[PDB]
Amino acid sequence: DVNFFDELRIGLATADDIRNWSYGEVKKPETINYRTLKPEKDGLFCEKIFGPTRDWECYCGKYKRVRFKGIICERCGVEVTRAKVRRERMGHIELAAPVTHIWYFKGVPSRLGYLLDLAPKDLEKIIYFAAYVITSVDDEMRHNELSTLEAEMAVEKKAVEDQRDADLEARAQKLEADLAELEAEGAKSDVRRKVRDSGEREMRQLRDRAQRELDRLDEIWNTFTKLAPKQLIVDEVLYRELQDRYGEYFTGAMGAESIKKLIENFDIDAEAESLREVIRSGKGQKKLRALKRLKVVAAFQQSGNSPMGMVLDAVPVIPPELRPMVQLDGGRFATSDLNDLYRRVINRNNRLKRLIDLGAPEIIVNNEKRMLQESVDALFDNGRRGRPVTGPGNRPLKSLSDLLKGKQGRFRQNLLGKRVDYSGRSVIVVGPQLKLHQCGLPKLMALELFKPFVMKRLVDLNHAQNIKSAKRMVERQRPQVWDVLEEVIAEHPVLLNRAPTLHRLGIQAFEPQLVEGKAIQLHPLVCEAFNADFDGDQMAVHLPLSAEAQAEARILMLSSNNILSPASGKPLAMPRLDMVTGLYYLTTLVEGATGEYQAATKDAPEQGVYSSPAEAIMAMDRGALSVRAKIKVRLTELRPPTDLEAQLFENGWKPGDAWTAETTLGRVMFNELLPKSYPFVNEQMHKKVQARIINDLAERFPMIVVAQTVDKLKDAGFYWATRSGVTVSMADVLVQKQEILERHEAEADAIERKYQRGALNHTERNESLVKIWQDATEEVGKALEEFYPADNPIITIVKSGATADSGYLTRRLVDVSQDVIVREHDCETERGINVTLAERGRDAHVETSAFARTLATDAVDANGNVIIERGHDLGDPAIDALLAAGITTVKVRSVLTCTSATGVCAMCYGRSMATGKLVDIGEAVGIVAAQSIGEPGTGGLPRVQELFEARVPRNKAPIADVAGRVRLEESDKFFKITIVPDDGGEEVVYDKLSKRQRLRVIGTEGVLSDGDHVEVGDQLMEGAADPHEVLRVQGPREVQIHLVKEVQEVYRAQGVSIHDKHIEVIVRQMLRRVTIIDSEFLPGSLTERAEFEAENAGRPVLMGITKASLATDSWLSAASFQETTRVLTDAAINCRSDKLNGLKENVIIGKLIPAGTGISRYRNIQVQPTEEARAA
Ligand SMILES: [Mg+2]
Ligand SMILES: [Zn+2]
Ligand SMILES: [Zn+2]
């Protein structure tokens, strides 16, 4: 129980290993006495083997106190110890006949089948007693006696031939005697023809019954001559005949004991050398069969494991506490299915012993051995072969495999995790008065949650004498504890989560505030991160306990520290839906307002000027000023626009200096919410304009400033939403359109008096309908804005901008990329990827592809002057600065080109989308990238899975194999594209292409035509290109650019914003594997590039995420991913040892994940105060 182990390794469990584990053999299929309800001796639940029912007490009772421990009872045989051992101790069942492990027989592929070269349909007929198998043959005696046996065989065969000829003539002779009478007696052509045709029918049987015996006798001799080990005999009458005579020359058996015999005399190395040959042409499946099966043959040779482990002579028994039988509520009994499945085995194993001792015939005995074989099969994996064992109501019993996979109805692959203590949930309500770092917590929920904490401080003071008394003081809600509750709650963070959890911002930390009521008060800004609508939703609360857990909540998971979405980089706490409309109304400008500014005339001076922003407030309170007016005032504590600041001062900022501008009072009050250092804006706040502002605020200021700024925008946005005057009624909604559409409809009706005959034209018809429909839509669009002033509530809201299957893909995305973490600051690789970056005469995809990147090379202008230098954050100010220089393309580091041996590096990955700074070392990007792609799952999802699984496109598209010109040939059968190479070599033609698979689109633009030039990477037709095709054409690095290109294009069609680096992390894991061609080492197992490249013929290989995730280093992580059965068998044979490298393994065993705070450099930190501060 050291909690730290290096390796976890498996292997086939021999019958001796099973006998070593067991504390005894369970001999009876008994569970518990029906009267005493106590464990029956020598059966299941027997205390003499598994363990005592009660702590430190034996069965008979002669040893009860703890004084006797580590001893056994002489009368009952129960070791006196804790009752927990019932859960840790196993039994075993000694089998009267060997039995095969169903995992190595019915597996796909069949391990025994590939080991002994037995077809799965032939192997099933042996262990289930459907055929005989030759175990051994004596060569010397057969060769020495072959002479005499051939003589006796031909003599017996001749004696039958002599009998056939003798019996036929005698009977055929008698047929002539009957016809002699029929000539003299009744003579007709049809009276004798029947018996004549009958006589021929009678004779035809005589020939065939004698002939069929010659074949039967020929079959015995030819089988004896070519008889050899491993041969099969399904006749069983030939076999008995084969054993009646020549019975001493050979031997044979059935069932698992015969399979056990072949392994006994079997040479792995001698069977390996035969499989080592790649000659014997084997251009097709003949050699690959020997190569594919060699994986199971060479696996036994390398290690010391004996293949005998596949046939069990003993079966282990799972401890009783894991297969319990306990009395239910209301007196009913309950028990696991394993007890009945174990009972099935021990019942037949015992009856087999009775049959053997009875000298029963082999039919009964071999039938019982087959039934014994099927019980162990059902015990391990029920229903894998034949119909499963069904209990009451015809429900399949749950075997051990169902237990291990976690199959309840169909599958629950640990996605339920496990329930935790110190948790709770309730319904959530709006918390508009809360700070971003706060959350409203019901007093009762916080009381029960912190119950151990308040009990301590309550005992520290004299309110309760001892801890037992304080428990009743908290449980009965004595009013003395509420003052104590606020102390233990203060500065003690809690975690909030709303299911489903899509991205990491679905779990955040807050500062708990004691709140009246039973609901949870949630901050209105985190709703978008939680996707929490306020209609009957609930959220769960978890209380961190350890100092490390509290630190991770206050630093990593704090609500105010997580603002930017860690997918695109945009802020998620930006105001929305009311604070947008509230701020839109405050900053909007209306001419002719009550306090409108008026220029000075000869009679009176300017009336719109105010001494300070404070006066305008006093004017706003009176009926003199409207907040939306155009007044111009003087501002001191507010800084001016940067365009006008240089003209006005140019001598520095103005903390106390004054200046004058023409704005609205609302725009003044709005800019006071922003930081003092931020310049003036003076615009009506759109939804895009506010997002534009929050973005620039996040970069130039620490997030605390951005957190409190958005918090100030919430108060004003909510405050002015009420004063906004937004209300709905009949007028603002009710549909004009009646008379409009009643008129347009008659035009389409009269078109039938034309389409019938005279004026159809067959294309003016469709064109007339489309034009008239769009014309009505154009008139409807005008009527939509013709009936409402721009201040209409619905219109105002629109203007401001206020208004399940995916989980499958996400889990595979997480399964393949969960191990991808940043492990080093810089790998110092010199080669990245080119970014398009601003077509001009401005690419909208630069924010996803070019933004938050790091330059691999310097950005050089044609004039010679260098601008943003390599290794730079490539911020948005740098893009605009680069755009001014007029440069098209830039080269940028990427994780696709990262040369890091382990994971990726910080420099190649770049800026963290959430932090806005360089990504930290501990960061685990693979999971963040998987969630970033999975959440939008809610031309679509089925296409996205096609790409990540690297399957063949639904409609294949041609790619140019070489560069040159193109010859377009159009035929009815299919299009024809022939590429004339610039080299002058053999032409490349692309034939039989469906005509509906339209041609690809191209200073002069257009669509591809005859004679165009095409480079190596151009796609010839519209559609999807085979990712395996481009792999061998352009190379592995161009594949990753192509994959991300198509994946990004799908999510862009729906309006989703995901940075390319997230997709690039998933695509990085596909090409990591290379296929070793052949032999130095051996065949094309999908290996690792670095492991192969860093040590000394192979290929680059593209493969799906599901196939890639199963190829990872650890086996018990791949076992939890897909089809635990196949993974475990291979991992058992090769004795694969799991080094616990990945984080999934540590989660399974409860270790600290090797990511974030679990990294060795971070968790080994030593903390000691400076001697300068110690002495003070
Ligand atoms: Mg809801
Ligand atoms: Zn006893
Ligand atoms: Zn790198």
Short mmCIF file of C-alpha atoms in Angstrom, two decimals, residues 771-1075:
data_model
loop_
_atom_site.label_atom_id
_atom_site.label_comp_id
_atom_site.label_asym_id
_atom_site.label_seq_id
_atom_site.Cartn_x
_atom_site.Cartn_y
_atom_site.Cartn_z
CA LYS A 771 -38.18 36.26 -59.31
CA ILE A 772 -41.75 36.85 -58.13
CA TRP A 773 -41.08 35.07 -54.83
CA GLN A 774 -37.90 37.06 -54.19
CA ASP A 775 -39.68 40.25 -55.28
CA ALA A 776 -42.34 39.60 -52.64
CA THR A 777 -39.54 38.89 -50.17
CA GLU A 778 -37.92 42.21 -51.10
CA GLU A 779 -41.26 43.99 -50.63
CA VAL A 780 -41.74 42.11 -47.36
CA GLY A 781 -38.31 43.23 -46.18
CA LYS A 782 -39.26 46.83 -46.93
CA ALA A 783 -42.61 46.40 -45.19
CA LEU A 784 -40.79 44.93 -42.17
CA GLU A 785 -38.88 48.20 -41.71
CA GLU A 786 -41.78 50.34 -43.00
CA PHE A 787 -44.13 49.79 -40.03
CA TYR A 788 -41.75 50.35 -37.10
CA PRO A 789 -39.63 53.26 -35.83
CA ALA A 790 -36.02 52.28 -35.23
CA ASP A 791 -36.71 52.39 -31.47
CA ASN A 792 -39.12 49.45 -31.66
CA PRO A 793 -38.42 47.04 -28.76
CA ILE A 794 -37.98 43.91 -30.90
CA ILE A 795 -36.05 45.96 -33.47
CA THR A 796 -33.89 47.58 -30.77
CA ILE A 797 -33.05 44.14 -29.33
CA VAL A 798 -32.19 42.79 -32.79
CA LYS A 799 -29.95 45.80 -33.52
CA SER A 800 -28.01 45.57 -30.24
CA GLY A 801 -27.02 41.95 -30.90
CA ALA A 802 -28.41 40.44 -27.69
CA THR A 803 -30.23 37.63 -29.53
CA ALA A 804 -25.98 14.26 -27.29
CA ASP A 805 -24.37 11.97 -29.86
CA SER A 806 -21.31 14.27 -29.80
CA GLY A 807 -20.18 12.63 -26.56
CA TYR A 808 -19.28 9.55 -28.61
CA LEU A 809 -16.79 11.42 -30.79
CA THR A 810 -15.44 13.46 -27.87
CA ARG A 811 -14.49 10.34 -25.90
CA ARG A 812 -12.45 9.00 -28.83
CA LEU A 813 -10.86 12.43 -29.28
CA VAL A 814 -9.96 12.38 -25.58
CA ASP A 815 -8.85 8.74 -25.79
CA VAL A 816 -6.23 9.47 -28.45
CA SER A 817 -4.94 12.90 -27.31
CA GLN A 818 -5.25 12.62 -23.51
CA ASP A 819 -1.49 12.00 -23.20
CA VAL A 820 -0.47 15.07 -25.24
CA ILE A 821 1.05 17.58 -22.82
CA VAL A 822 3.66 20.31 -23.02
CA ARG A 823 6.86 18.84 -21.61
CA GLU A 824 9.58 21.36 -22.53
CA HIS A 825 9.84 25.08 -23.22
CA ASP A 826 11.48 24.83 -26.64
CA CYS A 827 12.53 22.03 -29.00
CA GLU A 828 14.49 24.54 -31.15
CA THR A 829 13.20 23.13 -34.45
CA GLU A 830 13.63 25.50 -37.37
CA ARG A 831 10.71 24.53 -39.61
CA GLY A 832 7.03 25.39 -39.29
CA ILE A 833 4.09 25.93 -41.66
CA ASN A 834 3.03 28.71 -44.01
CA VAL A 835 0.00 30.88 -43.20
CA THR A 836 -2.01 32.69 -45.87
CA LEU A 837 -2.31 35.93 -43.92
CA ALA A 838 -4.14 38.75 -45.66
CA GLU A 839 -4.98 38.71 -49.36
CA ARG A 840 -5.21 42.33 -50.52
CA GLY A 841 -5.28 44.52 -53.63
CA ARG A 842 -8.18 40.37 -45.94
CA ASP A 843 -8.47 36.68 -45.09
CA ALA A 844 -11.12 36.12 -42.41
CA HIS A 845 -9.49 32.82 -41.34
CA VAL A 846 -6.33 34.49 -40.00
CA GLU A 847 -7.84 34.82 -36.52
CA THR A 848 -8.07 31.02 -36.32
CA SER A 849 -4.93 29.99 -38.23
CA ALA A 850 -2.50 32.91 -37.88
CA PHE A 851 -3.45 34.32 -34.47
CA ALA A 852 -1.71 33.40 -31.21
CA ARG A 853 1.12 31.71 -33.13
CA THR A 854 4.92 31.84 -32.92
CA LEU A 855 7.14 32.67 -35.89
CA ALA A 856 9.67 30.07 -37.00
CA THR A 857 11.47 32.61 -39.21
CA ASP A 858 11.73 36.39 -39.27
CA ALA A 859 9.17 38.42 -41.20
CA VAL A 860 11.20 40.33 -43.80
CA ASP A 861 9.77 43.11 -45.94
CA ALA A 862 10.90 43.51 -49.54
CA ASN A 863 12.37 46.92 -48.64
CA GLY A 864 14.94 45.14 -46.44
CA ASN A 865 13.69 46.28 -43.02
CA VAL A 866 12.76 43.48 -40.63
CA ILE A 867 9.49 43.54 -38.69
CA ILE A 868 8.09 41.12 -36.18
CA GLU A 869 11.02 38.82 -35.44
CA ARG A 870 11.02 35.06 -35.07
CA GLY A 871 9.89 33.60 -31.77
CA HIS A 872 7.23 36.28 -31.24
CA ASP A 873 3.75 35.88 -29.79
CA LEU A 874 2.19 37.09 -33.08
CA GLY A 875 -0.43 39.16 -31.30
CA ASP A 876 -3.20 40.99 -33.08
CA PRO A 877 -1.22 44.28 -32.95
CA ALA A 878 1.50 42.37 -34.80
CA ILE A 879 -0.92 41.23 -37.52
CA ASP A 880 -2.03 44.81 -38.18
CA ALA A 881 1.61 45.91 -38.06
CA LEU A 882 2.50 43.12 -40.49
CA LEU A 883 -0.50 44.04 -42.65
CA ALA A 884 0.86 47.58 -43.00
CA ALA A 885 4.14 46.21 -44.38
CA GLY A 886 2.24 44.40 -47.14
CA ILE A 887 3.53 40.84 -46.69
CA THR A 888 1.37 37.91 -47.77
CA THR A 889 2.68 34.72 -46.16
CA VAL A 890 4.50 33.92 -42.92
CA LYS A 891 6.05 30.73 -41.54
CA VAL A 892 4.87 29.69 -38.08
CA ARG A 893 5.83 27.01 -35.57
CA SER A 894 3.28 24.25 -35.06
CA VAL A 895 2.83 21.05 -33.07
CA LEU A 896 2.69 19.22 -36.41
CA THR A 897 6.38 20.05 -36.91
CA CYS A 898 7.37 19.90 -33.23
CA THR A 899 10.39 17.63 -32.73
CA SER A 900 9.83 17.09 -29.00
CA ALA A 901 10.50 13.50 -27.95
CA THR A 902 7.69 13.63 -25.36
CA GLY A 903 4.49 15.56 -26.03
CA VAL A 904 4.92 19.05 -27.47
CA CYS A 905 6.83 22.18 -26.46
CA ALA A 906 5.57 25.57 -25.32
CA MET A 907 7.10 27.48 -28.24
CA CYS A 908 5.58 25.28 -30.95
CA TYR A 909 2.15 25.27 -29.30
CA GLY A 910 2.17 29.00 -28.59
CA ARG A 911 -0.18 31.24 -26.64
CA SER A 912 -2.69 29.56 -24.33
CA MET A 913 -6.17 30.54 -25.48
CA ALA A 914 -7.43 30.89 -21.90
CA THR A 915 -4.45 32.65 -20.31
CA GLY A 916 -3.60 34.89 -23.25
CA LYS A 917 0.08 34.23 -22.47
CA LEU A 918 2.60 31.56 -23.41
CA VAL A 919 1.30 28.09 -22.59
CA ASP A 920 2.64 26.68 -19.33
CA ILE A 921 4.61 23.45 -19.11
CA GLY A 922 2.09 21.49 -17.06
CA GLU A 923 -0.73 22.24 -19.52
CA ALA A 924 -2.39 19.15 -21.01
CA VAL A 925 -3.40 20.34 -24.47
CA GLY A 926 -4.69 17.08 -25.94
CA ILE A 927 -7.72 17.03 -23.65
CA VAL A 928 -8.30 20.78 -24.08
CA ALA A 929 -8.09 20.24 -27.84
CA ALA A 930 -10.46 17.27 -27.69
CA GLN A 931 -13.05 19.21 -25.68
CA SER A 932 -12.67 22.23 -27.97
CA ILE A 933 -13.61 20.07 -30.97
CA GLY A 934 -16.24 17.99 -29.15
CA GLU A 935 -18.40 20.74 -27.68
CA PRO A 936 -19.52 22.21 -31.05
CA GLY A 937 -20.79 18.73 -31.97
CA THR A 938 -24.14 19.90 -30.65
CA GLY A 939 -21.44 18.58 -44.28
CA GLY A 940 -21.83 17.95 -40.58
CA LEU A 941 -21.00 15.68 -37.66
CA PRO A 942 -20.99 12.43 -39.72
CA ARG A 943 -18.42 14.01 -42.04
CA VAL A 944 -16.21 15.11 -39.13
CA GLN A 945 -16.00 11.55 -37.81
CA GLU A 946 -15.07 10.33 -41.30
CA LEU A 947 -11.97 12.54 -41.35
CA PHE A 948 -10.75 11.85 -37.80
CA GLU A 949 -11.19 8.11 -38.39
CA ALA A 950 -9.22 8.43 -41.66
CA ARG A 951 -11.68 6.40 -43.72
CA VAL A 952 -12.11 6.39 -47.49
CA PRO A 953 -14.26 9.33 -48.67
CA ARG A 954 -17.86 8.52 -49.56
CA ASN A 955 -17.36 9.94 -53.07
CA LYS A 956 -13.69 9.60 -53.99
CA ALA A 957 -12.03 12.59 -55.66
CA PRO A 958 -9.00 12.49 -57.99
CA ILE A 959 -5.73 14.18 -57.06
CA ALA A 960 -2.92 14.99 -59.47
CA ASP A 961 -0.13 12.42 -59.30
CA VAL A 962 2.22 14.71 -61.28
CA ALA A 963 2.39 18.29 -62.55
CA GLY A 964 1.59 19.37 -66.09
CA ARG A 965 -1.34 20.13 -68.37
CA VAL A 966 -4.76 18.45 -68.35
CA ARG A 967 -6.91 16.95 -71.11
CA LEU A 968 -10.64 17.00 -70.35
CA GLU A 969 -12.61 14.23 -72.09
CA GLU A 970 -16.38 14.04 -71.57
CA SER A 971 -18.17 10.75 -72.24
CA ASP A 972 -21.58 9.42 -71.27
CA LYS A 973 -20.15 6.59 -69.16
CA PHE A 974 -17.93 8.90 -67.11
CA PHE A 975 -15.60 11.88 -67.26
CA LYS A 976 -11.98 11.38 -68.30
CA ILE A 977 -9.07 13.49 -67.02
CA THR A 978 -5.61 12.89 -68.51
CA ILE A 979 -2.60 14.76 -67.11
CA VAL A 980 0.21 15.43 -69.59
CA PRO A 981 3.35 15.65 -67.41
CA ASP A 982 5.85 18.47 -67.80
CA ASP A 983 8.62 15.86 -67.51
CA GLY A 984 7.46 14.08 -70.67
CA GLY A 985 7.08 10.68 -69.02
CA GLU A 986 4.12 8.33 -69.13
CA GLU A 987 0.77 10.11 -69.05
CA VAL A 988 -1.42 9.76 -65.96
CA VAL A 989 -5.11 9.20 -66.73
CA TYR A 990 -7.99 9.28 -64.24
CA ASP A 991 -10.80 7.19 -65.71
CA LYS A 992 -14.39 6.24 -64.87
CA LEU A 993 -15.34 9.30 -62.82
CA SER A 994 -19.05 9.91 -62.29
CA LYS A 995 -20.15 12.97 -64.25
CA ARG A 996 -22.16 14.32 -61.31
CA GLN A 997 -18.88 14.60 -59.34
CA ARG A 998 -18.47 18.16 -60.57
CA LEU A 999 -15.17 19.71 -61.65
CA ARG A 1000 -13.02 21.65 -59.21
CA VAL A 1001 -13.04 25.45 -59.16
CA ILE A 1002 -9.89 27.51 -59.69
CA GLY A 1003 -5.21 36.62 -61.52
CA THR A 1004 -7.94 35.41 -63.89
CA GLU A 1005 -10.37 33.23 -61.93
CA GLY A 1006 -12.93 30.72 -63.15
CA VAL A 1007 -13.50 26.97 -63.29
CA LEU A 1008 -11.05 24.35 -64.51
CA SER A 1009 -11.23 23.79 -68.27
CA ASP A 1010 -9.32 21.91 -70.97
CA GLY A 1011 -5.62 22.74 -71.09
CA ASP A 1012 -5.18 24.23 -67.62
CA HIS A 1013 -2.03 23.75 -65.57
CA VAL A 1014 -2.26 21.59 -62.44
CA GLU A 1015 0.38 21.19 -59.75
CA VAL A 1016 1.10 18.07 -57.72
CA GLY A 1017 -1.30 18.85 -54.87
CA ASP A 1018 -4.31 20.19 -56.78
CA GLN A 1019 -7.68 18.48 -56.34
CA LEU A 1020 -9.16 17.70 -59.74
CA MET A 1021 -12.87 17.38 -58.84
CA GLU A 1022 -15.18 18.79 -56.19
CA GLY A 1023 -15.44 16.48 -53.21
CA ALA A 1024 -13.25 14.69 -50.67
CA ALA A 1025 -9.83 13.28 -51.54
CA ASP A 1026 -8.60 9.99 -50.11
CA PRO A 1027 -6.36 10.89 -47.13
CA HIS A 1028 -4.27 7.77 -47.81
CA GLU A 1029 -3.84 8.87 -51.44
CA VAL A 1030 -2.35 12.27 -50.57
CA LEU A 1031 -0.16 10.59 -47.95
CA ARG A 1032 1.91 8.77 -50.58
CA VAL A 1033 1.73 11.70 -53.02
CA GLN A 1034 2.53 14.90 -51.10
CA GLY A 1035 4.00 13.48 -47.90
CA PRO A 1036 2.95 13.22 -44.26
CA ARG A 1037 3.31 16.92 -43.52
CA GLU A 1038 1.00 17.99 -46.34
CA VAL A 1039 -1.59 15.47 -45.12
CA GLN A 1040 -1.91 17.18 -41.74
CA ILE A 1041 -2.36 20.53 -43.50
CA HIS A 1042 -5.06 18.99 -45.71
CA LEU A 1043 -6.87 17.25 -42.84
CA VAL A 1044 -7.03 20.35 -40.65
CA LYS A 1045 -8.12 22.29 -43.74
CA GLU A 1046 -11.20 20.13 -44.34
CA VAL A 1047 -12.02 19.72 -40.64
CA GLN A 1048 -11.82 23.48 -40.08
CA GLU A 1049 -14.00 24.08 -43.15
CA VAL A 1050 -16.82 21.97 -41.68
CA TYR A 1051 -16.97 23.85 -38.37
CA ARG A 1052 -16.69 27.12 -40.31
CA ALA A 1053 -19.84 26.25 -42.27
CA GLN A 1054 -21.76 26.29 -38.96
CA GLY A 1055 -20.15 29.45 -37.59
CA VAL A 1056 -17.97 27.80 -34.92
CA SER A 1057 -14.66 29.38 -33.87
CA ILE A 1058 -11.90 26.85 -33.11
CA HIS A 1059 -8.19 27.60 -33.35
CA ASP A 1060 -6.24 25.40 -35.75
CA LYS A 1061 -3.85 24.33 -32.98
CA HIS A 1062 -6.59 22.25 -31.35
CA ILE A 1063 -7.23 20.26 -34.54
CA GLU A 1064 -3.48 20.05 -35.15
CA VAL A 1065 -3.04 18.27 -31.81
CA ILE A 1066 -5.48 15.54 -32.83
CA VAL A 1067 -4.00 15.16 -36.32
CA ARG A 1068 -0.52 14.95 -34.79
CA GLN A 1069 -1.41 11.60 -33.18
CA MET A 1070 -2.48 9.96 -36.45
CA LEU A 1071 0.84 10.07 -38.33
CA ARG A 1072 2.96 9.20 -35.28
CA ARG A 1073 2.98 5.54 -36.36
CA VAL A 1074 5.11 4.04 -39.13
CA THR A 1075 4.78 0.60 -40.73
#
